[PDB]
């Protein structure tokens, strides 16, 4: 199942077109650029992914632009402040379509522990959001772990190959979670390792 | 339609059209090393997962500029917008024009040469000051002309470094400079000439230590049209280095191509070693080796090679 | 400047350019993630669930 | 000379497909995908670039026939060296090539 | 409990130093340690992960003590660590904090006095920076640090 | 097989485009535009002229006319960055203080 954006819609996808937009699909999530955006201790985790002991460059995701126009993907890592918030989503604007968002952390997902008045109660609120991380911070796996989550949502998300020909809305398939997913194999957990060792 | 002069013709041009093919192959896949080595040099691995070694992962990139939404300011000149990517790709593309690669594989054997490239390193700097106009920026703008500052800084010397060579070769042909290291490679006499022409190379490149930019408003395969072009100009710096200090394809055992692209891919290797290690100087500083330095290093050198090949003449 | 400033900082260019070799000549780091999994302690706090008691009975 | 002419077609079709495939790359980018005051220190480093190049372009006549020119050749650009190096030291003396204050 | 709060304390900063270091040296221009600089603090947040159960954010001190004891294994982590630490940190010094141009583009720039300190507040590195000879793990011992040498 | 008439009239042209440019402009640098144009003119007619004859005088007075072109170039930019600097405006017409 699919959802529209110019409702749910199912599969559109000749065999030529299909193979072309999976091309395109793969040449999406193999080759995706962040933006060099930090508001916090998320941000803080996301530049311990980009080191060396993480090595993000292996996912093609570490040529990290400095411009908004030659990002691919937004993570919001830190907390969303008032005074914050319209640069947000002045920088979200900034960006050329596809533009996908990636929240990390407890603070972007929902306003985490700050339910204060100066915070905005998650980056959804204002611009819309792809993938979630839950962590204060999230470690940098889980943000590899995001990574392909949205290499995942993108290879089958269908988009126009052109502005010449073809339906010009974008189609977003309505994904299983992870957790319904991973439901199977999480409740099997029997024993786990006493704390009191390393 | 059988005859040796128009097999000859269409041979020739499929000679060139393969060179031409490689460079810009070459100078993509490079970029893709470059992040490698670069993830090789801070003990990484790099782009290693879209392909067999990551071979792969170029054509995303490509894809992904190639189906970018394509964004101009309204502002802007569309021109002279267009046209910056157009010729930092194009000028070091036909600065490799006159490199010969191997004997009996050459593009145009010209009796220029160096002053072809010469002409080609002054398109780039037009090129990088159409990109600081174009985009309608004010904190562009001035970075363009700092950095098109510093590109004429070290253009004004890298002929005079590369001077010292043709004197020696007696004459502007490239073969004729390569067929002049037959005995003993152009580094050894023109060690001077060879790290002045280094350092105005790599800075008439924008490539680190000698890079508000330029490059913000750049979006979709503009911005691919200038690393393209950029990494082609490594290619181009680093071939010329080979053909100009290092004997180009003159070699005891390999073929001429074998040593050509072994010398040629050490340069490459190189100057990611310069992009990794080494810090950046700051604007004035660089200026000033650039005017207070190399240039009379360049103009003793002349004067010194001058001096020994006329002592050599008797 | 002067020329032992010179000498002195071209010095200390090829220094960094034979440690930074030398760190190349290294042994990687990087854990690879996903394919090697990450080792966590025991007491790491991570993903939350509700327990059982030995007779197997839920403990809340 | 069938070979001067064979290279002049090569240098020929590498300028039309070097540049044609600069143009056709444009195109395609963007054919494809959907959518939705200066100091005056400038103008004296391009002014000493102007100057210095065009003494470097009487050197570059020079080099290429050093040679047959003999040692006379070699005094008279030790002269024209020698008024370059002298410019060149007046122009760094005096603060016009420095760029900081 | 004060032995293992100073700790746990000197780990903090030990890692907080290293990241001011990298990014000081990447600011500058070289970019290449900040990658060696976050190894060591992988290896500093394997000690505090194993320790508090959390790599940035512990939250493992309490009101009277801490929140568990101290795991088996915590010695030899950090010994593993103590042997690791020196020779890094030599690196980064020989590779970046030696060389000329991060001290050229260092020295000199933004000094003031004791008399400046002391009339905005300044506190931490640049205070005893100008001469002022004030700590207050010294001065104001706190948490059992006068039986530290 | 390339007259030298056909050259010297394409050099005639350029350089009656250049006094036309640098007479009716009264944009300080579209006068030095013009004038750079006409002096590459005059080079370009001694180079076809240097060619005819088989000679390289016509290549050597080229060099010196684009070393004193270079030079001129500098000046003149000089003097409108200075003229620039103090009027704030690069109209020709208003250095016109001294007449009679
Ligand atoms: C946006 C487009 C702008 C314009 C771009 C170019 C448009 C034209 C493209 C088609 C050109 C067709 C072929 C032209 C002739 C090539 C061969 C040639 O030049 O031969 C003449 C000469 C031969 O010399 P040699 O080989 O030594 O022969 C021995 C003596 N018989 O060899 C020589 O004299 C060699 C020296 C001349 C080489 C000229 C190369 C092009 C120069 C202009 C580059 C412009 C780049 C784009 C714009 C940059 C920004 C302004
Ligand atoms: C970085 C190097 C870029 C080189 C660009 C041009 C490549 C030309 C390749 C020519 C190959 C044939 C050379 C002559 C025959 C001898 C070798 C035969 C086996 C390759
Ligand atoms: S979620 Fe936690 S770690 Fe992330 S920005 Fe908020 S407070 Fe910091």
Known sequence: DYTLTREIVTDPLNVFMGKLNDM?????????????????????????????????????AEVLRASPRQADLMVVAGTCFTKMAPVIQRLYDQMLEPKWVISMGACANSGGMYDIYSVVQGVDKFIPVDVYIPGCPPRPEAYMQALMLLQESIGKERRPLSWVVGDQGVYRANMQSERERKRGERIAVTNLRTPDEI | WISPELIEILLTILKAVVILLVVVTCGAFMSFGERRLLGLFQNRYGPNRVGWGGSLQLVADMIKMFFKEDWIPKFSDRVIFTLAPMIAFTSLLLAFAIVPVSPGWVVADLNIGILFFLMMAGLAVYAVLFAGWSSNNKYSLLGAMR??????????????????????????????????????????????????????????????????????????????????????????????????????????????????????????????????????????????????????????????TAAVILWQAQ | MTLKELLVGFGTQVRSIWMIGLHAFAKRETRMYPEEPVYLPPRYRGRIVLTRDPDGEERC | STEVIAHHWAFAIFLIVAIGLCCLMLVGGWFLGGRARLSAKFYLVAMFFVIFDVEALYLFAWSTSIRESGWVGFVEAAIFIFVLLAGLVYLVRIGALDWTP | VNVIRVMLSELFRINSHLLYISTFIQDVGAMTPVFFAFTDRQKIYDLVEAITGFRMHPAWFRIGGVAHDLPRGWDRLLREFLDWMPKRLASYEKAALQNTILKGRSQGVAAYGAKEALEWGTTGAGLRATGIDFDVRKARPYSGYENFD | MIPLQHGLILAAILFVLGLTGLVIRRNLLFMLIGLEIMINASALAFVVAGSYWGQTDGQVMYILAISLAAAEASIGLALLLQLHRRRQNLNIDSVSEMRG
């Not at chain 1, 916090?40 to 093609?60: K, N």
């Not at chain 2, 020696?168 to 002045?196: C, E, K, L, R, Y």
């Not at chain 2, 950029?230 to 004997?247: H, K, N, P, Q, R």
């Open chain 1, 24 to 60: 395109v699909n793969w040449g999406r999530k193999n080759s995706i650029w962040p933006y060099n955006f930090g508001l916090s201790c998320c941000y803080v985790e996301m530049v311990t992914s980009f080191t060396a002991v993480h090595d993000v460059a292996r996912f093609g």
């Open chain 2, 147 to 304: 950095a098109s500052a510093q590109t004429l800084s070290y253009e004004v010397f890298l002929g005079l470094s590369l001077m010292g060579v043709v004197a020696q070769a007696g004459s502007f042909n490239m073969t004729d400079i390569v067929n002049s290291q037959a005995h003993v490679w152009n580094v050894i006499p023109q060690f001077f000439g060879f790290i002045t022409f280094a350092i105005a190379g790599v800075a008439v490149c924008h490539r680190h230590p000698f890079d508000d930019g330029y490059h913000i408003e750049y979006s979709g395969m503009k911005f691919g049209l200038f690393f393209v072009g950029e990494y082609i100009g490594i290619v181009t710096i680093s071939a010329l280095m080979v053909t100009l200090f290092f004997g180009g394809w003159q070699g005891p055992l390999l073929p001429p191509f074998i040593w050509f692209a072994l010398k040629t891919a050490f340069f490459m290797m190189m100057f990611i070693l310069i992009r990794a290690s080494l810090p950046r100087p700051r604007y004035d500083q660089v200026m000033s080796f650039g005017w207070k330095i190399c240039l009379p290093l360049t103009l003793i050198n002349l004067l010194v």
